[PDB]
Amino acid sequence: MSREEVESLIQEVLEVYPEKARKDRNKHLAVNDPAVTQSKKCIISNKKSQPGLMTIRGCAYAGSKGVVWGPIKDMIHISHGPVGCGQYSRAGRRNYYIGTTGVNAFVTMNFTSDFQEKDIVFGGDKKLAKLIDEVETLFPLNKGISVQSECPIGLIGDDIESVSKVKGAELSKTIVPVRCEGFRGVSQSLGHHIANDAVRDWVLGKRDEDTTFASTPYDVAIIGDYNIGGDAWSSRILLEEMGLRCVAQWSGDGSISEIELTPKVKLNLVHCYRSMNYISRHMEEKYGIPWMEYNFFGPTKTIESLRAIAAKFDESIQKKCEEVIAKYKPEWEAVVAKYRPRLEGKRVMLYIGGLRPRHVIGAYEDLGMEVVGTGYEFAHNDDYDRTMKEMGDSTLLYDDVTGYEFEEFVKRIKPDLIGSGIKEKFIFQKMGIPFREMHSWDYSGPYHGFDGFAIFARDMDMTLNNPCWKKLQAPWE
Amino acid sequence: MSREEVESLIQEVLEVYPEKARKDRNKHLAVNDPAVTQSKKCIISNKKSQPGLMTIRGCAYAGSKGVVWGPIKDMIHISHGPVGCGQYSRAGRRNYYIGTTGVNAFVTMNFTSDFQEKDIVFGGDKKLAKLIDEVETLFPLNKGISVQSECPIGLIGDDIESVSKVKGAELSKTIVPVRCEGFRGVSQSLGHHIANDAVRDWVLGKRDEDTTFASTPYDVAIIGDYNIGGDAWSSRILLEEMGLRCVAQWSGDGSISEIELTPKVKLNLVHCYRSMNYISRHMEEKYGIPWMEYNFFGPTKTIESLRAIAAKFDESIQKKCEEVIAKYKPEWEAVVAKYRPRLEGKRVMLYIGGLRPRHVIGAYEDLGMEVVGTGYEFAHNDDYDRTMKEMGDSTLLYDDVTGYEFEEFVKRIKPDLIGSGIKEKFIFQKMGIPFREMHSWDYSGPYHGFDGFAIFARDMDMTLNNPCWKKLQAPWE
Amino acid sequence: SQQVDKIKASYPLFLDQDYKDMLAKKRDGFEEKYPQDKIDEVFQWTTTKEYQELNFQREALTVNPAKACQPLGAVLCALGFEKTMPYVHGSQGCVAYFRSYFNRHFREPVSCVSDSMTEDAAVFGGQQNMKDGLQNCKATYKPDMIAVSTTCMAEVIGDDLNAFINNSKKEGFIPDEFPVPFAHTPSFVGSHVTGWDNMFEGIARYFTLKSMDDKVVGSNKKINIVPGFETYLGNFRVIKRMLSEMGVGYSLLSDPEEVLDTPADGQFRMYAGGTTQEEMKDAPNALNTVLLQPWHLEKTKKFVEGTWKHEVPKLNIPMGLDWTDEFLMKVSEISGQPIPASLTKERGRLVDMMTDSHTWLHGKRFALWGDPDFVMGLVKFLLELGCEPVHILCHNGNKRWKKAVDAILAASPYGKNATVYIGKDLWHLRSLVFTDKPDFMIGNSYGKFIQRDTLHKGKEFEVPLIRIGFPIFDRHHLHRSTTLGYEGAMQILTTLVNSILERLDEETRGMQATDYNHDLVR
Amino acid sequence: SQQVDKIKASYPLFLDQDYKDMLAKKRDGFEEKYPQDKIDEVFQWTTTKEYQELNFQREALTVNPAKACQPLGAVLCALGFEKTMPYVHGSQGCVAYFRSYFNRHFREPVSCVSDSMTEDAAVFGGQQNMKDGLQNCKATYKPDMIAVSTTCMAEVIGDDLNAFINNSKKEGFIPDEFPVPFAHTPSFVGSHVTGWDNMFEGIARYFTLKSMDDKVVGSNKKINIVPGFETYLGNFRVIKRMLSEMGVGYSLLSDPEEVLDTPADGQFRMYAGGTTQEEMKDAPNALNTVLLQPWHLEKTKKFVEGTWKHEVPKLNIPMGLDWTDEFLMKVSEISGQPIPASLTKERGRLVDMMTDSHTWLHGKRFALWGDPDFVMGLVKFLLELGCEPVHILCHNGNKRWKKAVDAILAASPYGKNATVYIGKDLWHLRSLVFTDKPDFMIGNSYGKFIQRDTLHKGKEFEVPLIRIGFPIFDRHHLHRSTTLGYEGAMQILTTLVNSILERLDEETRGMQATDYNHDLVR
């Protein structure tokens, strides 16, 4: 509580910055008021970062290749350009899949054009065509190729669209050019938009005239779940236990055939609104498929989402939903009874990219834990509209927070546990506050659904109550 | 070389000792003269060691439990007494076997009575009976037990023979008491004798009245091969390629049933004369079974032994011997052609126990290498009678050599290679002369037979010509 | 389903029957997967030599490279100076990736800033971004000095760092006296080590080019040491320790070990240790400059010889036995200090370990990859141990380095069956270790996938990976290890011999089948 | 048959078809082996809980013990003194076994002599053997001092070492001034650590009992350090280094690190380093005496407090964070020297490593065995890491030590499921790890066979071994490792976390089956 002291903290943190940076960053920090549903009057987001302030944001290439296109297992993704971008992003995101890597699955592999000075000076369209030929020769079981753009291609004027068209006509193969150069936009969000547009333009409509697929009234498609440590899998089983048939999965453990079959489903269950809202809306306009957002973080949100989803179908689906809820009730009740006493009353500050800073609040509250501060790297204002009603009164909200701001806020608020990325983990561990990686789940999980809830509680308990946190001060100091 | 120089070296090394020790140790060093047949006139062996001169010799328990009884896989050997003796000798000897350890094989296991002060004061016969009962309960598939005596049992008034008799009658089991206390004798040789006598008295005659075993004119028994690194196995295959049936091997990979079947064979092929001559002679007197010594070290000795063994049987056996020799000729010819050029002219000094100091000379000569000094820890005068003719003129002979004597002799002679045990390996490696462990084959092998000859050459080449030996002197000193 | 007392993570909870049935249904219904026999036949084909010829005929496609881009090395070089902020002129995604990469390798905070150039800068350049970023960085994080590198965006656009920084100083955004060294680090030229070289050369230029009038060689009686791109903190520590026991005054340039190994005692230190500006300014007064990794510090060598007038010795990386000896004697000759008894004893102990482990070390076959200097040092050390290198790969190598490596290989009979590959990636190496199977690989974490592939062919075809190099992501605290000098040679020897022994123990653990050779003593 | 280009040792050359046929024929013809189904059923029975009750009902039979006899520890203690010859009064087979044991552990020469008592001495005693042995040893190997221990033969016969040595000096066999300390070390009492304690107590008595008149406590301003039975040279080194950075004058008693780590430079040194006679004579003048391993130096503590009048602190083994801190503060209090910044930084780095690895360390189950002090230190450190001890075994432990360990376990929730076993051997531990499976074992080389047995039950039942303790026979140069202090804690933590990670990597290496969790980053 104590909104006024939070505003005083905000101003005190702001005092260090220069005039222009001061006034820019003042708009991106806010004190939450749950009654406010219009976050534009309270917080500004989706703007360019201030130079030299150590932001956490990524680039559009990370949004497109790293997030959306990369998880597709049966397609080969060429990081077209210099060698760094593919190397730093190779296998850094735990998008789980089932396949034989190097034969019919290529997710953890780094394909790149390895640009040199001659390619910068004289262009790389011919090199792109030669690379496509070599990929066809060396990986015959591939079912499609994507060409993900890095900065030099956008700067030097290479026409990858024409190369993709000619080579796709030549080899009768799907070649998707993505203009995902890193200087476009201000974060990974424009990467999401560009990848969605590429999916729409080059992949989605390939089976519009095809009617051989047998459809059922219970066909659904999971959109925006990227199977982080198997998360999507732990969701699908629940949906399969409710009696629904999951045809497609965007894009965790995903295949191009599933994306092609997506326009045949009856309902689109969207988990990450921020990354997949474009394609969900496009599918609604073109095929008439309704979509709905759902949350599988924690037993309460999972039950609410399951009942809301079952409400879209007939009575048998609702009965199956009640059966599933009854079956899984004792497990999460036992998890709560075991772990809530060790977690009750602790305070959490969160800072993640665009969906989780508000999605995981319910799971934390299910264990008797309070979120006092939250923020986003690249969310839009509608995300903050959704965030305000789920956060407590007079809690701190931050957009595109700087490292200095984050450290000062943590030092003042003194939370019991911080959830953020790898670029804050060791900073906050050295100050003696427990930290959980909330992008990759600290190489653990999954966290979605009932099975993931137990892992979530176990991980939170193991990190928050670890004895190591009592030892930072030497006995003679 | 230069006999008088070697005698001068012997006297110079002798000068350090006190008068009594000087006088005793002068008899144990000699200059070889191949014309000499009686070695008693030049060298004295099988005497007590001088106190505190750092001898390499072991004890009678090492000779009995460690060497002879231990390799028997299906019998459980109880190191009766304090805990040290079984612990230091557990799995220290690479006597290889095939079995499921802990169920029907127990070679690498250490069974002990774990003597405490109360056992010293009040005796341990009741403890022995209780231990036997516990062994029966916990290891039901065992096919016999031996009780190996350590020093206190000889010192205190314990009667293990009566306990063995009563327990063996009660459980209908073979229990062999071995009075192998370490203070008996002067080395492992008396251990060999005592173990042979125990085998004769308690195990050998159990199937004298049994005639169910079907015998053939080509039945043979391998005696004195302990399957070091699989050596015995590499011998047996040759004998079975020759057309002979190997009923038993003492005691490498040995079983009590094989020992019981031994009195049914037509010929005893003895490899280690020193340890098994007693039982070979006993079998000759009691059953009429002839025995012969043979050498499988190096292709020359192997071929000579194969032909000599062939001469004991009919014409088909000799034809098969010639077939085996012809089959294996190209392999060892290729081994020689590859390795002799890198080993020709090198000088070797050897010091081992009872048999190998003269057995491995032929294999060294097959690679063009010269043995300049050799000696024994515990061999008897007949072994030196064989060694004198096996060794070259004016070569050094040493019996029960001390550490100081060995170091001085090596420092003067300066051999290219030394063959000895683990207690000299690091001493001689620090001085910069390559060393090969000739008891355990440096955890390599096997060396017996044609297959083992290749490993022998490869190992000698790898150690003699290793680059590490050129780096002992720092470039600035 | 989950049991509250024994909760299962992704492995093995996805091995439950319900999840297996779900995955089978998904694959059979919607993935349109190729038949398993087709997949097996394609895999077997990729294990063959014909696939190797097709793989080595590649000219445009790179698969799983073994290098990075220049600004990463530039950031690593910049972090080695006291209270210095690495500043990358360009797009922010590169800085995010660099920070994540170094965080995962070192498990430590890694500080770096960007000026966040966008399409507007793609049209008009990033001068305003530079001014605002320098002002904001100095005001917020208070560094003593800002070192500026570039992303490929700024390099392709053509931004002039010198003019931009001069205009920043002229317009009052940052003080004129504030040190702002800069270097162009194009990602399409060379690799990360080239970026390290460029960063160091630019910093040394900034601090010494315009003040050489009063410099006299050998005045301060010290030796400059330049480590290059280095990711083992034990390497800095052992260099300093050996120089200390010898009583040799030294000035180590770009020291990042303090800032990369800060204690966890309740406070966050953004800066720690590092080479001071005074040392950089006084460097031309040293007796000489020793370059630890000469094969990626050629520009630095050219500057040091041309301007500081230092006769830079022709020294290899002090790895293994002989090269450490040569480094020690060269340092002794330059400084006039004799080699003490402690170093001689340490060398003797290393030789003793070599004699102890030679039997297991002899004749073993290794594939290996990494940076040129590290690769040649490890190949030299392996030759000294009697090991046989077979596949030697260096993605960022050149022809002269290959010639020197071939010369090293010709001087030992253990290099007879060795081939050096430059410009090849880890797909090439996967083909090589399928077609000419070694006993082990030596490389960074990316090799683990190669290991997996060999296990898929069979247990008898598996090539275990030995983790030496950069980056190491799947093991903890290996960045503290030592690779240079006698201590590093001891650590490498222990790692190699014990990996061999663990492999042998695993292969002989089957009871009544292979356990006859499961010796207690080895 | 052998191929000249690829020659095979025992493994896998015995896996050839001809050898397999030969072995099958041998077994079927002459071994009279039990049927394989019977063997499998007996093995499965031995993995059960009923077999565990039968195993734990043992009273007379010991199977695979985890200790040695006193004279081994006496020899280790004697080797820690300058130019000192360990001399065992008894039979020569014991000396051969001691030397081979220490040679295999340290891979170094180990010097020791015996007077070679035979059946003749069994009725007359070994007085003549003692005289001749002392004379010959002094004349031949020229030691500065001879330390005499006993085998069980001399103990049972009842030889009086004091009278024998006095008569040797009276009859001119050795000079009266030559120092010949002695101790009775019966093998049927205690274990090797007890022999170390007895050896050290006798030596200190010989050098200080009769000259206490002029001794004043604290005169030399030093602290005595007694390590006890120690087989890690890094432990001696880290103790000396920690005392050195603190600026604390110290006198280490029984230092064997020099003689156990001599260089290989072309000469053999029989003696090297070690505690001098002057230090032993001046020990009563120290401020205090600190005992590193109090649970096997009780006789030494009694002598030190009774005669030297030193208030020996109640200190645990300085293993792990808390006990290293307590040792450092106690040393600071005794010496008056503050703890410097370097030690604080090292402690902070250890805490940082703990925070980095806590996620993988948490909740893991360990069986462990070894000597009492080492076992309790490792249990304390594992509790500090959030690990769960389950099976704690100490063959040479006692009831008071078990009570103290239980007190340590009660003070942490991670010790809830832990049981302490004293007087149990490794067959008991095999039963325990079959019936209550932990994640890993921590112990010496003899544990490998237990690991084998688990693999026989199944891959899912395998418990990997972690090699910490004495003796280590199947790995090279692990005797150079460090266990005490912050550096030892860092090494132990790295070993544990990386063993966990290698196990996880092996479990997830199956392509298309378990490799979904074969992450690049952990």
Ligand code: ICS
């Ligand atoms: S038994 Fe003897 S010492 Fe004949 S006690 Fe010894 S496995 Fe030696 S020279 Mo070790 S009489 Fe065997 C022997 Fe030779 S243990 Fe082995 S190598 S051929």
Ligand code: CLF
């Ligand atoms: S914002 Fe994004 S990550 Fe940055 S470059 Fe642009 S697409 Fe890529 Fe790859 S190569 Fe290196 S890291 Fe850059 S500087 Fe040239």
Ligand code: CLF
């Ligand atoms: S000569 Fe031989 S090895 Fe020596 S004791 Fe005697 S049988 Fe045995 Fe075992 S227990 Fe220890 S080592 Fe001895 S002193 Fe008492």
Ligand SMILES: [Fe+3]
């Ligand atoms: Fe860290």
Ligand SMILES: [Fe+3]
């Ligand atoms: Fe050694």
